[PDB]
C-alpha cells in the first residue's frame, strides 16, 4: 500500500508516540467532514494538530487519486 507507506513516512518525521498517533488518526477516512473541521476539535495541542493535519491532507490527496 503506497498510502500506508506515505503515511508512515510522514509519521516518522514526528518524535513522540502521541504525535505519531495524531498522524495515523488524521489519515483515517472520514467522508462527512474536512481535515479543517476535524482538526478544530483536537484538544491535544499544536504538535498533534500539526501532525494530524499533514497526514489528513496527504491521505485525502492520495485517495482522490
Amino acid at each position: 500500500s503506497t498510502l500506508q507507506k506515505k503515511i508512515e513516512e510522514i509519521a516518522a518525521k514526528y518524535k513522540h508516540s502521541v504525535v505519531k498517533k495524531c498522524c495515523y488518526d488524521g489519515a483515517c477516512v472520514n467522508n462527512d467532514e474536512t481535515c479543517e473541521q476535524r482538526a478544530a476539535r483536537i484538544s491535544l495541542g499544536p504538535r498533534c494538530i500539526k501532525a494530524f493535519t499533514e497526514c489528513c491532507v496527504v491521505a485525502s490527496q492520495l485517495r482522490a487519486n
Partner: antibody
Amino acid sequence: EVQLLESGGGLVQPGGSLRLSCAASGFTFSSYAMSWVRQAPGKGLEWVSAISGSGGSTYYADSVKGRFTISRDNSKNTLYLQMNSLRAEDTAVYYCARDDDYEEWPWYYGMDVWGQGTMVTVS
Amino acid sequence: ALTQPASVSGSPGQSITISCTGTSSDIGGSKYVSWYQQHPGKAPKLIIFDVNRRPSGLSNRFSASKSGNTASLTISGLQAEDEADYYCTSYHPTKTILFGGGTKLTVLA
C-alpha cells in the same frame, strides 16, 4: 519495533555502589531525552533522573542528588545510571524510559517507551 | 506527589473517572496531563488517546481532560483487561517530573 532493556540490578550492601545500563533500539537514541524511574515493591512510581538527547543537560530528584550520576553513550544507544552511597531507601525496580522534551511544556506528553525494569535490593 | 484516590471500581460496561490533583506549578501550568497504566508484574505503559470520535457519539474507551490544578482520566465501556494501577504525571520546574500515588482499578462482576 522500539525496545528498551535494563541490566545491572542485584543485591548490594548499604553504602555500596552499582551501575545500571539501558540499551535501546528502534529509534534515533540521540533525538530523545531519557529518564530513570523507580518503583519500590508494592509502591508508586518515583522519578529518579533524566538526561537530554545530547547529554548536555541532566536532572536529578532531591533524594538522589549528589549520589547518583546519569549519562549516555549516543554511539552505542546506551543509557547509564551510576548509583553511589546506596541506602535501604533506594531498594526498587528501576526502569529506563524514553521521555518527551521538557521544553515542550505546557504540552509535555510523557514517557512513551519503557524498559522491563531491573531489581535493585539494598540490604 | 500528585494526589489520586487509592482505588476505584465498577462493572463491565460502566464508566470510571480517576482524578489527579497537583499545584499551580505542575498540573496548573500544564495544558495536557499524561497517564500511565500498569498491569501487575509489568512496566508502566503510556496511555495513548484517540483523536477520532466514534460515529454514534459513543465515548472513546480512554479519554482525559484537565482544569486548573486537577486532571481526570475517564475509562468508559469498562472491560476486565482495564484492571490495573493508573498513574498521572506532570512536569514541574524544580522537581522535574512528578507522579501521582497511583489508583488501583478493580473491575467487578
